[PDB]
Design a binder for this molecule. Structure first.
Ligand SMILES: CCC(=O)NCc1nnc2n1CCCC2
Ligand SMILES: [Zn+2]
Length: 140
């Protein structure tokens, strides 16, 4: 589990979005495994605006943050998981690291702020859903 709280926005994994998220929808993409809902209180997180390929991510199944190198966001085939079938996921970054289903929503951060959240795992990789490209999460 986990979310990004930027301005009046909650960024979550689409597959973990609640009824309240859906009832306060601002934007979803099922190929990006992202959903954004509106908040009443403002959030503490800053979104990275950069093309960094190094950062640190939180792994709840280890209670540990790991420094990782990761690929640039791309369209990638993902094998079946407990929460999605085998499918193409867009805007996905991969690193060598530990990721189980419940690690989804852990932040990846670089020197510039929040890069994305854990979205995939298995076979010794962790996959992150990029948010740097959503410039609107930092704007009105
Ligand atoms: C499909 C890409 C995307 O970002 N859709 C959400 C979105 N597009 N422009 C904006 N937003 C939300 C707030 C208005 C600014
Ligand atoms: Zn950066």
């Amino acid at each position: 589990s986990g979310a990004i709280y930027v301005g009046n926005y909650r960024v979550v994994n689409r597959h973990l979005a609640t009824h309240n998220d859906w009832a306060n929808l601002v934007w979803e993409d099922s190929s990006r495994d992202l959903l954004v809902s509106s908040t009443t209180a403002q959030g503490c997180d800053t979104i990275a605006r950069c093309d960094c390929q190094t950062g640190v991510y939180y792994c709840s199944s280890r209670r540990k943050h790991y420094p990782v190198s990761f690929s640039k966001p791309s369209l990638i085939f993902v094998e079946a998981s407990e929460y999605y079938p085998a499918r193409y996921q867009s805007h996905l970054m991969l690193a060598v690291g530990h990721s189980e289903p419940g690690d989804c929503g852990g932040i990846l951060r670089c020197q510039h702020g929040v890069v994305g959240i854990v979205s995939t795992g298995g076979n010794g990789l962790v996959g992150f859903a990029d948010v740097r490209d959503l410039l609107w999460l930092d704007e009105e």
